Each structure stands twice: as structure tokens, then as C-alpha cells.
Design a protein around this ligand. Sequence first.
Ligand code: Z73
Ligand code: Z73
Ligand code: Z73
Ligand code: MG
Ligand code: MG
Ligand code: MG
Ligand code: ZN
Ligand code: ZN
Ligand code: ZN
Lengths: 308, 308, 308
Amino acid sequence: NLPARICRDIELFHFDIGPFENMWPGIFVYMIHRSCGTSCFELEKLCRFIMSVKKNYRRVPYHNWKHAVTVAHCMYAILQNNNGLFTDLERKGLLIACLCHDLDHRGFSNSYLQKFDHPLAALYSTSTMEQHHFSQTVSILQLEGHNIFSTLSSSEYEQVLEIIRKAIIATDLALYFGNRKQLEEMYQTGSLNLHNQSHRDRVIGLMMTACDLCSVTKLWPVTKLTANDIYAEFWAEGDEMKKLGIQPIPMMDRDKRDEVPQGQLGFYNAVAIPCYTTLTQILPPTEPLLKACRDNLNQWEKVIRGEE
Amino acid sequence: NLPARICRDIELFHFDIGPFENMWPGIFVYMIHRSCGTSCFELEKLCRFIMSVKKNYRRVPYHNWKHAVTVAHCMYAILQNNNGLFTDLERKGLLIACLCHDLDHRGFSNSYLQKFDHPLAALYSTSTMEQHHFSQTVSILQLEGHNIFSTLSSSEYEQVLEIIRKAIIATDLALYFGNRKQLEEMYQTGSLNLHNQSHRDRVIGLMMTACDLCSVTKLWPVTKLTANDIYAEFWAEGDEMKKLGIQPIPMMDRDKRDEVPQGQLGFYNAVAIPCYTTLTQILPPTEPLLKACRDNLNQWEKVIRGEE
Amino acid sequence: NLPARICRDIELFHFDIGPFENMWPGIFVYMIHRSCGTSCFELEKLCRFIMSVKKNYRRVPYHNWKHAVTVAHCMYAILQNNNGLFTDLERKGLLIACLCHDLDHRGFSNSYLQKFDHPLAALYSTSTMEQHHFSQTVSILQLEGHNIFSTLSSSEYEQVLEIIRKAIIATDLALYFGNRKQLEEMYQTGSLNLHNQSHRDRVIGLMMTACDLCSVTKLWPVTKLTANDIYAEFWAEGDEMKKLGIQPIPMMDRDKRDEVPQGQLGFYNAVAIPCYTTLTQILPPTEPLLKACRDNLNQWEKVIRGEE
Ligand SMILES: CCCc1nc(C)c2c(C)nc3ccc(OC)nc3n12
Ligand SMILES: CCCc1nc(C)c2c(C)nc3ccc(OC)nc3n12
Ligand SMILES: CCCc1nc(C)c2c(C)nc3ccc(OC)nc3n12
Ligand SMILES: [Mg+2]
Ligand SMILES: [Mg+2]
Ligand SMILES: [Mg+2]
Ligand SMILES: [Zn+2]
Ligand SMILES: [Zn+2]
Ligand SMILES: [Zn+2]
């Protein structure tokens, strides 16, 4: 079914899923089959699920269907290089969580929705969007012919939905910083315990962050181009901010676009590098993600000093 | 249903309707209910109407669904601050006219359609697009389950359709100049008579112009950004003009984009300021529209002299 | 049905089909009727065919539905100015081939699909896309109510599908160079024989090239603007190339966009001028296509030396 190069390269952390949208669902199915065997998801339901999820992603520059699949791939690479650490249901739940983690994203951050006084901010006070992304996942599961978890027991159903809920909520980067701080203290004290469910939850949350930010772990040309999509959303949000009468944070002001390289150094130094560093400590086979991140940091440093 | 901020701010003339498309129909329904009570439009038909109208707007940069709703809002603010001046049917008709006034707009002016020898120019010699926008409104009303005026008598139906026809045709800016000149002489002579149906018609036409141009009555950041959308259409039309072998008017030539500030001073001085000035004379509670216009004129003057 | 200007201008080689998408199918039907009479295509099936073909074109900057119709028009002008040279079925087949020749084009060249290891490259080793475009044409013909060739005999059906297959495959510009070389030797030796089916096939292939490149035979403003769409695709492909780790050919590198004028001189000198020159030798009434091409070459030369 899938090409030769894709079957080889899909195992690489820095794999790009390519421009051909119609290939991505099969990419995702292949990944699902190759983690949880060909035997646990009914292929007609699964594809009906995938295609409905795709439909509920929006045509935004970055937080789109392609991002969903790119994020799911990263999890696949992590899961594939840490065999026997996670359960069958976890590998299912995490792959589906990643695919659905940005469902119905409109390009705006939680802060804007708050400032806009959006209805979703009234419903979900914290992790507004991420709570909506989970709510959307449920609703798609509850469509006729879409319940990909019908073969599971009721207990396993609740279990996997809880795995998915927590993993999607972890993609709220506001939660990353505390999580990663906790995990860092657990590692340095030697107290991190993967048999501890609370600890597992945090490690899963950090895995989710690592996957969500994985654009920074690709090769320079991919990383550089995706950066345009990211800022295209930030600047559109800064515009909407100015339309509300609020002077947006500099990152979101297209008039300050000359400062993108500096904003990137900021992001890598405060978020990306610490994230992959901590993940590599906990899961050493994720080293390539960190190496690629360090490499892209140097590229941004080359950009800054005029060597682009 | 609607957010707290929106319920407060929607009463302000300079209210922006925001980036969330799915909120606009409820914004429009709220406005309709709050002008004509919750009791005269059957909510299932009304929403079926609104969603069909939305479907027949095109994905053009400016004359799109968002513009339709923005224009309808302005009318709502005018109508809300001039209570008892207009009838129930007028407030209904004008709100619906505004929503439908640009139905099936493809980003091109009447002059281009003429020069293109477009079929619609053969059907409607004058006010080509505006006659088509009305024709489109009728056709959507005549869809099964879409006749939002079924509770009305036949007489009131004809009446309201005539209100709508005239108001949509008034959005042809070629007609503005004569209308506003007449209204200006009627005011200065003391002969303007709102009990005179012919006079009312003109005032309604000027209200329609004021609403249609209301982008110039928003706060600078909104006004400035919408200006890009306006010129994005003008330049696309100037391109099509050059493709016909006709050197377009400078406003429509993207090579002369450096002259946008001057074109804006031209527009405000000849069209916008006179329009809101005359409206404020006739309807004093519309003063804020004029103040905002004067403010934006100064911003364009700041742009011109390099203070942006 | 069609406007007055269009009925006049549609006979001109450099006719632009305009910005109004909804007019193009009638433009194509008019062209089909005016080549093969109003009597051989059943209008309800034909329009069902046209609208299905349109649906299977993608929203890419250049190789889109508009291009399809523009290419079909050029064939119409060639066919109209060389009466009695081609058969009824040929004129049908070639008009339909042109409409379908880029069906499901995603903006990428055969080389990229190859380098990507795309599945279509496995199915069709040579002329990958063009073989897929033909495969897509067949599939649309085989839809219920879409078989526009049902009035034909089985023999004439095979015949016309073979005409279409060869003409679509000829739009692979890799094949142009050999074809045109052969045709050039046949002309200079006096051995070209239009009663020779093999020779006819080549002339048809060159006609297809001439139609496909016809953007270079329009008036400067059309030619210049379409060039942006062409490079918008090339640069997107060069991006995807860099994402695969391959440094793309300079034409496809947006960083080398300053070299577009030179790339154009290259293209006209090596491909376009030779193509129309050879066509004018074989079909003298196609001279205007060559004149327009030479004119645009001078415009590109004016651009180069700073006279834009
Ligand atoms: C919401 C996007 C998070 C995210 N994902 C990636 C790949 C990025 C990148 C490369 N840069 C960012 C800079 C600031 C920021 O602030 C939120 N987020 C960034 N980001
Ligand atoms: C058709 C657009 C009318 C219109 N609405 C707005 C808000 C505008 C603005 C800000 N500027 C304009 C400048 C020229 C012009 O000429 C037609 N129309 C303009 N316009
Ligand atoms: C695939 C596009 C063929 C094509 N059609 C037109 C009208 C063009 C033009 C104006 N320039 C081209 C320059 C390079 C190139 O290389 C392929 N193809 C070009 N091209
Ligand atoms: Mg998110
Ligand atoms: Mg209009
Ligand atoms: Mg092609
Ligand atoms: Zn995400
Ligand atoms: Zn309007
Ligand atoms: Zn083509």
C-alpha cells in the first residue's frame, strides 16, 4: 500500500508526512496497525473516524489536519523506540489523542478567547481550547458507525477516554512548565517511578508536548517553513487583539516580524530544549529529537548573526 | 446565549463582530429580536434563511459574509439610537436588506461588469450588481422553508420587499452623490419631511450608505486592516481590467499602491465625511459615526506625513 | 446566451476567458457546438460531464480548472482556423482531451512525484501525471449519466479515447522535445504527411503543447500575471524538494526569484518559440500564436534591461 521510501523513513523521528493529504490517513492507519497490530481496530470504522476528524479540522495555516498527523507520527516514533514501556490501550489512546488534540482549532490561543469573552471560555475556564478539542473527540466517537472502541469493554473504554482526555489537556503549553519542573525534580532525586500512575501521567503529558512541538525537531528546511505558518497565526491573532483595543504581545505583532529569530531563541531556550532534554533523560531513545532541536537552535543563531 | 462583552459592546457604533463566523448568525438574530421583538420571526425559518444567505456570499476579501453582518450591525446601532422614527416593517426590511445587500458579490464593480460585457449588465443596465443582489434575496426567500415573511399579509409582504429593494439599490454608491445632494438641500431649506415617503426613502438610502461604508467609523486598527481587504479587491479588478486591454483607474492599479493614503483622503473628503455629516444633521444620535470618521481621516493624514 | 464581446473575441487566439467561473462551461459548450455542430453531444450529459471534470480539478494556483478551459479555447482557435484538416471525432477528442488534460493536478511535476516515491510513480513509470489525468478522464466518463460518447459506435468510442489518451500524454513536456525535433526534420525534408497517422499523431501532440503553453501567446498583462501563478507552483515544489533534502533546480527555489526574467528567456528560447515556429510551418494560420510569443519575449527582454 504505502511507498517504499515512506516505509523506511516513517521510522525516522524527523520524517515529514509530505504534501499529499490523501496519503496521510493511510500513514496513520499503518502507524496504528504497526503499534497495536492489525487486529484491534475495525478498518471501516477507523477510516470513517479518521475522515470525520479530518473534516472537523479547519483550514488554518498551522493548527490543521497536517499538524495533527505530524504530531501523531512523532508519538509513533517515540512509542516505536520505547517498546514494552507502554500498554496496548495507552498506545491506542495516545495515537488517537494526537490525531484529535487540535480538533476545531481556529488559530487562536486560549488568551484571545478569554479576552474575546468567547462562549467556550465560559464553559471551560482553564485549558479552554484543549477541553473543547476533547469534547469534539467524544462527539465524533458518538457518531453512528464511528465508535472505534466498540470492541473494548466498558472499563477499557473509560480508561482509554481518560488517557485521551489527559493527553489532549497536556497539549496546553501553560501546563507544560509545571509538569516539566516536577518531572525534572523526580528525575534528579531518583524518585521518578513509571509504575506510579500519577508519574506516568506526567511523562505522557511531556511526550505529548514533545510531539506537539516536533516541528522544531525536523530538518532545517522543514522547521524554517513551518515557522512561517506558526507566525501567520500569531500575527492574525495580534490583529484581532488590536481590533479589541489591546496591544498584543510582540510575538503576535506583525510590525515586529523582524524579531522572529529572537523570539525563536527565546522559545527554544525556555521551552523546546528543556522539554526534549527532560524527555531524553526519561526516555533515552528519544535523543534524536533533542539533537535535531539543538541543531535548529544553531540555525536560528546563524540567522541572527546574518549567516541565514 | 451571547457573551457578556458582546451584549455590552454590540450597542456601540464601532463594534467589531469578531473572527468567529459561527457567532455572527446569533449576533444577527439577537439584533433582529431586539429591534422587532422575539415574536415576529419564526426562529427555525429565520436561521434557515440566514444560513442560506451566508452560503450565497463568496469567499472574496471584503464584500463577503462578514461585511454583510458588519453592515447589518451598523443599521442596528442607528435604529437603536433613533427609537420611534422607523416602523416595525422598516426595521425588519432594513436589517434583512443589509444582510443581503451584497449577495453573490464576486469582488467586481459595476463598471468592470459593463466593460466585460457581463450578462448581468445586459439584464440590469444600471445598478447592475445591486439589482442582482435583490434578485438573489427574492430567490432565497422563495426557497421551501425560507419565507421568513409568511406571517405578514400580502400587502406587508409587498411593502417590505419594496423597502428591501430600494435599500439594496441605494448601496450603489453612484446613487449616493445625487441622493446626498438632494437631502442636503432639503435640510438647509428646512423642507425635509420624514412623513414624506419620497423623503424617507432618501434618508433610508443614506442610512444604507452610512452602514455600507461603516468600516471608516471603526477604531483605527479595524479600519486600517479592512482597508487591505478593500484594495485587495480593487487591485484584482485592475488586473482583470489590464487583461481586457484597459488601463484601470489608479485606485485599481497595484503598481500605484504607494498612493493608497491619498486615495483614502480623497474618499473620506468626497464621500465618507459628507455622508456622516448629512446623516448626523438628519439623525443627531448618529454623531459617533461622524466622530470616528473624522478620527480616521486624521490617522490617514498622520500616515501621509510619515507618522503612520 | 453568451455576451456580445465574447462571441466576437472568442475567435481571437489571445482571448482571455475572464474571472467568472460560472461562464466557462457555457464557453466550452459553445466551442464544442461550434466545432462539431449542436447535434452530436447530448447537452444534459455534456454539462454533467463538464461539471464533474471541474470538480476533479484542484485549487492550485495554475494547473486548475481555468487553465483547462484556457487550453481548450486555444485548441478551438487552432481548429477554427484550420477547417477541413481534422475529422469530427478528432475535434471532439481534442477539445475533451484539453479540458481533462490536467485532471487532479496537485501542482507538482513528475520529477517530484518520482523523488517523493509517490504511488502514482509506481503505477506509471513515465508520464506519471499525464497517465493519471487520462485515467481520471476515463473514470469520469464511466460515471452514471456521464458517458458523453454513448451516441458513438464502439469503434468510434475506442478511436476517440485513443485520440484523447495520446493528446493528454503529449502534454508531458519531456516528450515535446523529441516530437518537435522529428516534426522539424519531416518538414525540412518535405516528408511530413498528414495522411500518415503516425505523422498526424505528432502534429496533434505539438498542437497540444502549443495549447498547453498558450499563456505565452496572450497579451502582456495576461502573460505577466499568469507567470506569477506558474512560479507560485514551482516555488511550492522547490519547498517540498528542500523538505525531502534535495536542493531543487533554481527555477523552483523562491530564494532565486530574482532570476525569473532569465528563466523566462530560457523557456521562450528553448521551448515556446521553437514550438510555435514549428506549428506555424505546419499550420500557417497559427501565425498569431507565434507573433504573440515573440512579442512577449521582447517584453521579458525589456524587463531584464530595467524597462519593465
Ligand atoms: C502554539 C505554538 C507552540 C509552538 N509550536 C512550535 C513548533 C513553535 C515554535 C517553532 N515557536 C514558537 C514560538 C512561540 C510560541 O508561543 C506559544 N510557540 C511556538 N511554537
Ligand atoms: C466599493 C467600496 C466603497 C468603500 N467602502 C469603504 C469602507 C471604502 C474605503 C475605506 N475606501 C474606499 C476608496 C475608494 C472607493 O471607491 C469605490 N471605495 C472605498 N470604500
Ligand atoms: C509546467 C509549466 C510549463 C509552462 N507553461 C507556461 C505557460 C510556462 C511559462 C510561461 N514558463 C515556464 C518556465 C519553465 C517551465 O518549466 C517546466 N515551464 C514554463 N511554463
Ligand atoms: Mg493545541
Ligand atoms: Mg455592494
Ligand atoms: Mg500537465
Ligand atoms: Zn497541536
Ligand atoms: Zn456592501
Ligand atoms: Zn496543462
